[PDB]
Paper text:
We previously designed adenosine-SAM bisubstrate analogues that contain the SAM cofactor with the S-atom replaced by a N-atom directly linked to an adenosine at the point of nucleophilic attack to mimic the substrate/cofactor bound state. These molecules were used to study the substrate recognition of the m6A MTase RlmJ, the Ribosomal RNA large subunit methyltransferase J that N6-methylates the adenine A2030 of the E. coli 23S rRNA. m6A RNA methyltransferases (MTases) catalyze the transfer of the methyl group from the cofactor S-adenosyl-L-methionine (SAM) to the N6-atom of adenines at specific positions in RNA, releasing the cofactor product S-adenosyl-l-homocysteine (SAH). Two crystal structures of RlmJ in complex with RNA–SAM conjugates were solved and revealed the RNA-specific recognition elements used by RlmJ to clamp the RNA substrate in its active site.
Crystals were obtained for GA* and GA*A bound to RlmJ at a RlmJ/ GA* ratio of 1/2 and RlmJ/GA*A ratio of 1/8. The structures of RlmJ bound with GA* or GA*A were refined to 2.3 Å and 1.6 Å, respectively. Asub is pushed out of the active site and unable to form the stabilising interactions with H9, N12, K18, and W195, observed for the GA* conjugate. The GA*A conjugate is maintained bound to RlmJ through correct binding of the methionine part and the stacking of the adenosine at the 3′-end (A3′ in Figure 5, corresponding to A2031 in the E. coli rRNA) with the conserved residue F8. F8 π-stacks with A3′ in the GA*A-bound RlmJ structure whereas H9 π-stacks with Asub in the GA*-bound RlmJ structure.
Numbering used by the authors: 3 to 50, 58 to 280
């Protein structure tokens, strides 16, 4: 039975899957195949009361949906053709629906209950390989892709402050093996100081061309839980900065009617 999740489809998922879909659509502009590598792939889909009421529900049926959200929202509608929100597609299903016949998917998830669900989403998809394995080890084992093109999505649990260091080390290892790939790292903002230190750690790797996309629903706080989330993109498609500048004001206005927080795009390290 599909996994239920109180947080699925919230503002952070909206931002993460919007960015994912735009990167995939840019990669599809060239006919050459590419790899989609999902290090922390989850269950695949989520059965939706819940934070989706403040996230995807606020945008998916809007008449003025920006063109930059059409690919993502059309996947959500594919899984909800009745017009009632019942299922939220995870990053693996976004990729399954947007990738072309010549592209490849490599998905990993250690969760003992969610790995079987993920496997069942791809049992009839010959483009995909699903493994019950550590996500960061895939940045060593699966890179570089034989196709020499790819999006690597890194979407891990952040459960203590050593995890923030593990993500940067993992990315450095992937980048050493595949310096031209696009790496998209999702992060939460609970304590801003922890994100500031992670970003410094990422800069200290020497990797260039790192874009930061962040959407906050509340100002930074000491005891409000997750107030924001973002995507750090290494080697973003050239269009992505402008696409996010086009869509972030609309997205923030729909996700946060009270107008609190912010939505920004900027460079951590330039080319
Ligand atoms: C940041 C947590 C995201 N994670 C993967 C989501 C996937 N990329 C998507 O876009 O749909 C959520 C799923 O990861 C698995 N998981 C395993 N262990 C945890 C912990 N400790 N916290 C959260 N998530 C965990 C689950 O399958 C989640 O649904």
């Amino acid at each position: 039975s599909y996994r239920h999740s109180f947080h699925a489809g919230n503002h952070a998922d909206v931002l993460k899957h919007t960015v994912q879909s735009l990167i995939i659509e840019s990669l599809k502009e060239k006919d050459k195949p590419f790899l989609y590598l999902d290090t922390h792939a989850g269950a695949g889909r989520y059965q939706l009361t819940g934070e989706y009421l403040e996230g995807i529900a606020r945008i998916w049926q809007q008449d003025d949906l920006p063109a930059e959200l059409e690919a993502y929202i059309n996947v959500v509608k594919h899984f909800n053709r009745s017009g009632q929100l019942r299922y939220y597609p995870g990053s693996p299903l976004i990729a399954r629906q947007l990738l072309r016949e010549q592209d490849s998917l490599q998905l990993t998830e250690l969760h003992p209950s969610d790995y079987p669900l993920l496997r069942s989403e791809f049992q009839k998809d010959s483009r995909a390989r699903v493994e019950k394995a550590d996500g960061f080890q895939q940045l060593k084992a699966k890179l570089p892709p034989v196709s020499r093109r790819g999006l690597i999505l890194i979407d891990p649990p952040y459960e203590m402050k050593t995890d923030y260091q593990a993500v940067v080390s993992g990315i450095a290892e992937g980048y050493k093996r595949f310096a031209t790939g696009t790496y998209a790292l999702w992060y939460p903002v609970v304590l801003r100081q922890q994100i500031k230190r992670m970003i410094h750690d990422l800069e200290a790797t020497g990797i260039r061309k790192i874009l930061q996309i962040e959407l906050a629903v509340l100002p930074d706080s000491d005891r409000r839980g997750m107030t924001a989330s973002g995507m750090i993109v290494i080697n973003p498609p050239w269009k992505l900065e402008q696409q996010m500048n086009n869509v972030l004001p609309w997205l923030h206005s729909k996700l946060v009617p009270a107008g609190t927080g912010h939505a920004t795009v900027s460079w951590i390290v330039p080319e």
